[PDB]
Subunit: 239 residues, 3 copies
């Protein structure tokens, strides 16, 4: 199988970091039998809330509040209810982690960084938003420590930042699952036999099928769905 089709083909050498990311992706796919599941979510309440408070948030705190912070929080709370999803396959046993440490993807133009928000369940939305802008700030300056990259127990990727509608991600070995949060799209939907216009978002979950099946994955996805759909001005506190 030839790897070249012209004399003018460009060869790009691969540094130690990039090669390690690639080896990680290969190991993950080889070791984990992935299955995938998708759920539609009404994010209108979240959109309305975020846009109501975003401007005064940036005035008061100095960093912006993204939709992502709310999604991290909703995932964190659902993981408290479902520890089987916060787990690791280890041959003859499944290890359920006591910490909810959410790996988030923040990619550069060249490569992909996956820092970890430790104990995400114990942080507020403001706290998560602070940490996101800090980690993105450190990824842009190349000042990202190994302590920032370690101890992740679950991964959430904001693929909607890249305009995707549906995606299937590779699980961050040795974790059990990865959730992709897709684009928020205005759609005509049906509510009580009427046609409404709502801000819909797909949640796309890849699972380690040795650990989990559709039943548990579905119950988990429903829990995140319910957490997102309950977001309004009265029900959700930023701190």
């Amino acid at each position: 199988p030839p790897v070249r089709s012209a004399a003018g083909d460009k060869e790009i050498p691969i540094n130690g970091v990039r090669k390690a990311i690639a080896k990680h992706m290969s190991v993950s796919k080889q070791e984990i039998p992935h299955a995938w599941m998708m759920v539609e979510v009404d994010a209108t309440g979240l959109v309305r809330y975020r846009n109501a408070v975003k401007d005064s948030f940036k005035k008061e705190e100095g960093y912006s509040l993204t939709y992502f912070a709310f999604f991290i929080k909703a995932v964190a709370q659902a993981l408290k209810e479902f520890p089987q999803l916060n787990s690791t396959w280890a041959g003859d046993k499944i290890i359920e982690h006591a910490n909810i440490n959410i790996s988030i993807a923040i990619a550069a133009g060249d490569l992909l960084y996956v820092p970890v928000i430790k104990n995400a369940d114990e942080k507020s939305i403001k706290g998560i938003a602070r940490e996101i802008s800090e980690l993105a700030g450190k990824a842009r300056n190349g000042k990202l420590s190994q302590a920032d990259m370690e101890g992740g127990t679950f991964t959430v990727n904001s693929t909607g930042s890249f305009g995707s509608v549906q995606s299937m991600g590779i699980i961050n070995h040795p974790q059990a699952a990865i959730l992709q949060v897709e684009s928020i799209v205005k759609r005509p939907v049906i509510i009580d036999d009427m046609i409404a216009v709502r801000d819909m978002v797909n949640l796309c979950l890849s699972i380690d099928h040795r650990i989990l099946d559709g039943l548990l994955a579905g119950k988990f996805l429903q829990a995140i769905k319910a957490n997102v759909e309950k977001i309004s001005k009265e029900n959700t506190a930023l701190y």
Copy 2:
């Protein structure tokens, strides 16, 4: 070789031989089979309306309930008779197409996952299929599920719509050739003859062994199931 623990208070749950077998099966299937995936949208409005018209008097007479799933199993079984290439097994030297249409169905209880088989499902009526569903699901909760029920499967159908899923990619039950996930039935605005209609739409999601099958056969097969489901009404469909 990476760390598997992140706290002293991490809980270790031992894996029994049954769950360990299921897990080894999932790994073998993924290693051995190059999966590719296809999806079609299906108007299940006729099926919903017909089922809801007859479900009440069915449970009164038969003693067991008629679900949406029974209709799908019947629609799949007929389409497997149309396309035996889907009802097959890779054997390196040759491909074996099976004459018997035996459909493995996924029934999960909590964490553990069972796959009992409905033998010769093309020859059974919707009534007969419904009977065997309630029988096998009854024995799955009781744990009185025999080995003979687990064996002989040539195709797998999973009712992922029970878990509220809208789209799914399943792992093929090796050494079978394909698996179908029947998703949730969802009311959707839809275009019929340039008009906006409210229909009961369902996704059918198929994983294929790409050593055996391509998009052409898979597309034809999915179209056959689609046509089988979309023709369901009071006049076209007999339960017995």
Copy 3:
């Protein structure tokens, strides 16, 4: 195996199957999808198709426009037009698009060479020629070689969404699904549009979602700008 049927696997059919297996083992696949408004494309193709077939002798399909849109986007994103080679990534100078033209029993994947330098007419011509060569068993070895990206017309089988296996050692495969009329929202109004999903599988050793997304956005913008006055066939 009582009334079972046995179909033997010849050397060609076995080679395809081995190639599928190797690809899935060597390449860690990830997948991404965007929806695109193909109304402008549909309207333009239908307005011009009949006078095209009369003048040229071969038909103009939707697929020719999609090849062109992908090829133009690959000029901006050479990282997708690439190959994993151990310690190096090789970006290819030629945009040679492998297309699936399955005729009858099995699957044929010939290659439209330098597709970025051909017109929509030229691409339509080449699809016709390659389909004719596949039907007549006349595909040369040169026709099968040199592919740098693959596009599959899964819409022809009525697929709405799809995940394809990458043609190793390429970096990515794009599946173009069915064009379906859909109720859609445009400036808070309900419109009816011709929507098509573009489904992309990538080698995650080479590419991530950020690059894949930008690429899909470029194809989206290329397709959605096709109109009655914008694009020329020649």
